[PDB]
Design an enzyme around this catalytic site. Structure first.
Site, mmCIF file in Angstrom:
data_model
loop_
_atom_site.group_PDB
_atom_site.id
_atom_site.type_symbol
_atom_site.label_atom_id
_atom_site.label_comp_id
_atom_site.label_asym_id
_atom_site.label_seq_id
_atom_site.Cartn_x
_atom_site.Cartn_y
_atom_site.Cartn_z
ATOM 1 N N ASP D 39 0.785 -1.214 0.000
ATOM 2 C CA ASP D 39 0.000 0.000 0.000
ATOM 3 C C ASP D 39 0.817 1.263 0.000
ATOM 4 O O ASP D 39 1.738 1.436 0.806
ATOM 5 C CB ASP D 39 -0.975 0.055 1.194
ATOM 6 C CG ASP D 39 -2.033 -0.996 1.149
ATOM 7 O OD1 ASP D 39 -2.321 -1.601 0.072
ATOM 8 O OD2 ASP D 39 -2.627 -1.245 2.229
ATOM 9 N N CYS D 171 14.828 18.253 -27.652
ATOM 10 C CA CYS D 171 14.400 18.156 -26.283
ATOM 11 C C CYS D 171 14.283 19.595 -25.760
ATOM 12 O O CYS D 171 13.294 20.257 -26.040
ATOM 13 C CB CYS D 171 15.392 17.337 -25.458
ATOM 14 S SG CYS D 171 15.315 15.568 -25.912
#
Ligand code: DXX
Lengths: 364, 365, 364, 365, 364
Positions: D39, D171
């Site tokens: 979790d 980029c």
């Protein structure tokens, strides 16, 4: 005559600077510390930049005092050596510029006392500023700050006239004699420059501070007075007294002459076979330099002001050697400054020509 | 000249022969790899307002502008040394200009209270380097990408010089530094080379001026600063001030620097280790080396290069480089113990520097 | 009497201060700690500055209690020595000023309970404030805060009258007898000053707290009461009891006299051959000074209030020596304070003249 | 192939046999448990813009996009390996795409000053990986959940390639990287497979363009970057750039990568430890392994897998894995001493990778 | 009946609390931890203050579970000892108040899922909240939260009716059986209080979770289900199973009775000659307490729910002694808590009267 252990110059050499028209090499090294290195020296520029003080760990509330004590020393440099007078003037221009930065005075606002540090009260700040304005003009002959100086002098004079006690508070309801001493001296300096008589208020002030604020037998002032209650904090203070007597000697030399031998008997401990001296901050203790930790350093300034070479030598033999001065690349540094404001107050005491002599500074 | 000294990466002869060989030395190539290689963190990774390289080296904010500029100066000489690296140098100079304009670089001007615009008046250290950079970028590349800005800044500089009662321009208000002026004046020479103008004419009056209260002729050294409002000159002579100033002036008036250079050496330079090494005192009246900002020896390395003084260059680099413990790891240069601020920048620049006059005469691409 | 090991003054000397019209030298050294050093002493100025508390690592939520306990001790200093009455008044002026700063009361807002710390509930804060307003006026004769004191007394009285239980909560649904005790005493002080009868609500309060809130056999209060559920947290608390019985002894001395021997049997451990004592915080444990860690220090105050010199001596022999007091430059410091609020509570217990005697303070 | 080497979790033969056995190895399964199990703190716990898993590993912000993408690429092969994990893989890819769109992932674009919108222009490393992920999600799942976004982004990429004078997309502005382009181009192939379009036609002109100044064809190695404004290429060859590029290109033009692969090995791969291990130098003119971004050996592991080179795969994984001290605790994999950024991601991907061509050909669900 | 090493009370003593109408002394010391110390105890006030959790380093995301598990235990304390019922009620009022603070539920918004934590999804948060509303009302008889309870029950019921799978997700697309078990139990409790039939949905749920979500041979649930892909994460989970079986036993005892022996065979390791037991979190490992680290602690709760004294004893012998409990000033602390939620879950297991018994709690 003889250089004491750990000292940089003799007492005789400090006292002879003005006759020789030259500062000692260690005072010159201090001026290098003050002026030399880009960005980080305290007198690098007029900007609101405080890197020098950041590096020394100066607490914010102390910055205004550091700048003012530097300025007081610089005024004597100007008197000592005509060839350094322009430099001194330059540094004083910076000092005044920095002093007006909010990093310096902004505690007034942060503490809740107001947004304007000049308009009322706050005499430690504005007293120093007003003295600095005047010393800048005595050194340089410049009117750059005269408009401001005329204004601030008048605020001070008006606030004195309006108060039921003689003088002006710092924080509301906190009255300190040492802070008032600077403000009153600032009126003397304005009067020298302008031919006015703002200094006429000084008598009533000197009368007022010799009531509950002084123990006349001990030659010592109490810590503070608090007009709303009428209380005086019931402890006598050496640093308070030393600073106050030093500045008052330039206004009423008799006053300081009367109390000075009593002050010494109350607070000053001579030790090390007569070679050294150290100053207790209050009565009922054997400890030296308690409280703010400045008793011995302000007493050094007082000794200088009173012309007491023997006490000056003793105190500097206590203060300087343990701090481990060195001069590296012709610039002075201390490995172990013993207090706040250390380099500032040792500078000022080494050069100090007397407040009365500063008042009488010949024109450029 | 040709034996490799202990702890050195290349011989002084090799540095001085780069241009004749049309090749940089392997260690200079390794420095260019440090400058360009690793994503995001190399100083010349991109044109953005990103400063990770300088964060990693703990560069103080106020020093960034100088780091970029000294890189730029070295890059211009790389362009001249090796035609095959001229495009890379042009690229890096484009980045240097772009970064130089970021507020992280110039913003101290505003934070100190001096103004919101770092170009419009005063602040000659910043804007002098910027203008020189604009010019070097264009000499290297032939690109007019920054010409509109270069034309504007050159004219602001020229106008401010004309309007002042002293020769030159201040940095902070009321702080005059000869070294910062030297860069502004050289920037005019570069603008003139590119445009056919005569902004450089102002240089004569400036050289006359600085040879008055600002220079000590006995010692071939400039005083630290001048302060026009008081007329004060701070009464200490400064080696790094002098070295930098004489190096840039030698590209404008070689005789001026030649006049002072032997005096400057006698005043500040200590030869030691049996003649193998040298270190530079920052001021008079001390035996200590590299006091003050700590850059006397490194700027003297540049000057030695500019003056063609191979022996002093060798001595200085023997003092500076070995204790800093260079290594080349994966063909990229690093120093374990940089001895000063601006260390890799200044050792780079000195290794490649072709002379300010040779840069002015750079042939077109 | 004999001075016990590690003690600064004898128990006889503390109990004799009022008869001698003089504080002991170590109480004076505490007042110097409180007042002497610029900027950092707690009573330096009226400003919203808290450096003194920053230096001692005082948690925000404790500041209100620190100021108040100092103020309670200061009122006794005024009664002890007429020559320190003006100082005490001054310090109380500062205490009230600081107490009103949002750094002190702002937890009320940060915790989500409201933007105004006076209007409802929050009796720990506003009860101490109201008592302080009254003590300031008893000490000084000044009406500086009377308009505020009149207002706050009426909010308290109204909130008591509007509640179905006798008193006022702190946080919503949290009722504590010690916090109420301070509020009720504040009404008695207002009545002394003004000739009113706000204290008439005290009788119903004393009736109410002697129900589920007290174990009358053990002479001990439960920790708290929670009106919405009617729950009482089922553990008895020594510090709660000691504080409450001390303040109540100034309103209904018989009430405290009835429970006091039982309280001692429940909580107090005499040790070290009868020389020392330490106080367990709750039942069913042998550990001393659990919980908030204040059982022994509040019991020291209680012993002073009740005139129990032997327990006072025992408790101070437990508390003070391990904290390693020293007096340096006539100012008191502890190397190893054993709890929160340490110098405040040892100050208060050393000077405390009795809450009934404070109520009866003669005019200036 | 079949003795388990020291410190290894499974043999090379076992990794290469996963698809034939229709089952991942137990250590791969333990990696998937690390990815999915605990979790809140597992990276594939939920679709939310939470990054605890990456906080716990000290992932730099700029690296997060790469971590998610590499996980996604490995997950696509898991889907192909074991049909019974295909739904899990699809679920994880849904999360990956969701997370990839969170501003914590792409926000560097805006913080660096390049724009508020990470998709509209440039920024191909981000949007190339995103576009490839949209496609892989859809190949794995058959779901059109992201098809509208995929159709849009594919068209922005195609348009920007058509508008540029060089083949591909930058980029940061003016920074062209072949590895980042390779991912964008492969994204077009995946869109085409799903839609029957021909956006992949632009690939030929790209493969021609990267074989000019961007490649050293004798060494089989690409240069670090290209800078369209100057035309410069940064003059150092890069192993990690090459390995990644050749791996992706082998799914588009297998012959291209087959041509260069032996040369690439000779240039950069050091076999050591009596033939049992290998490590990869990042650039030429050094003996040091894994310089630069520190990823040459890990990307070469991926390339070896793509090329079917079991011996080199084995040697690299013997260099990489044992010193990182894997352990499996409660059926979940952890490394005590990951040797680089993106460590568990790239070892995952290399262990499962079925080949980019095989992913293109993935059968429907 | 023999006290095992390092234990505070015997298993027999825990199981006999309700028959004796008294909690054990260590449970009382836990309730003191919970309630005693000003500001820093978790049940100090209804405010949005979380100092207690800050001091134990509780991650934000875990705070909602801590509060809920405390609340569950508190409901059993109410049933054990009528004299602590009011205290329990008070603490439950605080627990509900805290549970509603944004510090507790605000991860929902920070993760990007929405600004309102109950309108849809988020069943772990709102399931616990809804159960808590109901337990508060069972314990106290108060309607303070009934309006909110009526609304939240209806949101849950509507969401279950609208979903194509039986239940509600946590994060979007994340279905957990354990989180659903709490929501369904909340409907039983609402029905008990109101006479409604929201619990009728339970049958379809129990049918649904026995499909791909369970391995019926192993008596174990899979980790989670993801409706958009139809994926079930292919690892069985002990803590998931233990918590689910425990809550389901209060709704359909036969369901949990069927799977319980299988669950034990799958996950529980008895060791130390039969004195201790520890729980593997998943299949294919020997390691205990992997994953979230709560398998043994939720199995402790399950053992309690199922009346399995021997496994309870074994697990508590594994969990408690190494955590080094002590009781200081009648308040419990662990030097080395072995997991998140440690004191909460050991508290809950020690007191737990059975979910079916809580549903049947008699009125106050
Ligand atoms: C004279 C005046 O203006 O009044 C002066 O202050 O200089």
């Amino acid at each position: 005559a003889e250089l004491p252990p750990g000292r940089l110059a003799t007492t005789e050499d400090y006292f002879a600077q003005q006759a020789k028209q030259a500062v000692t090499p260690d005072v010159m090294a201090q001026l290098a510390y003050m002026n030399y290195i880009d960005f980080i020296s305290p007198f690098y520029s007029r900007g609101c930049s405080f890197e020098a003080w950041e590096l020394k760990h100066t607490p914010q509330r102390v910055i205004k005092y550091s700048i003012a004590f530097y300025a007081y020393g610089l005024a004597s440099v100007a008197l000592i050596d005509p060839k350094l007078r322009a430099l001194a003037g330059h540094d004083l221009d910076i000092a005044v510029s920095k002093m007006k930065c909010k990093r310096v005075w902004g505690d007034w606002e942060e503490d809740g006392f107001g947004t304007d540090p000049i308009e009322k009260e706050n005499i430690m700040y504005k007293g120093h500023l007003n003295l600095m304005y005047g010393l800048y003009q005595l050194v340089t002959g410049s009117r750059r700050y005269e408009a401001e100086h005329a204004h601030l002098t008048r605020i001070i004079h008006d606030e004195i006239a309006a108060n039921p006690f003689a003088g002006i508070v710092c924080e509301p309801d906190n009255y300190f004699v040492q802070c008032n001493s600077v403000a009153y001296l600032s009126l003397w300096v304005y009067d020298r420059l302008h031919g006015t008589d703002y200094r006429a208020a000084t008598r009533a002030w000197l009368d007022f501070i010799q009531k509950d604020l002084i123990d006349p037998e001990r030659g010592a002032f109490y810590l503070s007075y608090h007009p709303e209650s009428g209380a005086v904090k019931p402890w006598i203070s050496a640093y308070t007294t030393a600073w106050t007597l030093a500045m008052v000697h330039g206004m009423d030399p008799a006053f300081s002459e009367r109390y000075y031998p009593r002050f010494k008997q109350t607070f000053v401990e001579v030790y090390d076979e007569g070679r050294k001296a150290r100053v207790r901050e209050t009565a009922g203790t054997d400890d030296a330099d308690g409280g703010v930790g400045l008793a011995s350093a302000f007493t050094l300034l007082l000794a200088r002001e009173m012309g007491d070479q023997q006490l000056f030598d003793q105190l500097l033999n206590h203060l300087e050697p343990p701090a481990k001065p060195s001069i590296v690349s012709a610039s002075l540094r201390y490995e172990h400054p013993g207090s706040l404001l250390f380099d500032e107050l040792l500078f000022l005491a080494k050069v100090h020509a007397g407040f009365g002599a500063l008042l009488r500074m010949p024109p450029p």
